[PDB]
């Protein structure tokens, strides 16, 4: 409280901004590929099933 060395609120705000940036990266990948499952990282089972089909 009233610290000058540690800004806990800034740490949490940065975590929330990073979470938003991660969601934004995911939506950008869906837009440029046209795929909600574009790689094995997205959903490995459905990705492998679609690859075989």
């Amino acid at each position: 409280l009233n610290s000058i060395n540690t800004n806990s609120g800034a740490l949490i705000a940065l975590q929330n901004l990073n979470s938003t940036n991660a969601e934004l990266t995911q939506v950008q990948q869906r837009i440029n590929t046209g795929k909600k499952i574009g790689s094995a990282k997205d959903n490995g089972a459905i990705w492998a099933t679609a690859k075989n089909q």
Partner: protein, 53 residues
Amino acid sequence: KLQDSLDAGVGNLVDADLAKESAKLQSLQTKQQLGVQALSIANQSSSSILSLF
């Protein structure tokens, strides 16, 4: 006809719904700007007590 059914089924498994993604994109861009503003607000906390000295 079977090849067309298999290709359409692969599309059912992996393709993004881009109309839904456009809404997610707009809201996430707003959320990112708000997160940058919230981080700026949190960054200001240390300077409030400078007035006490």
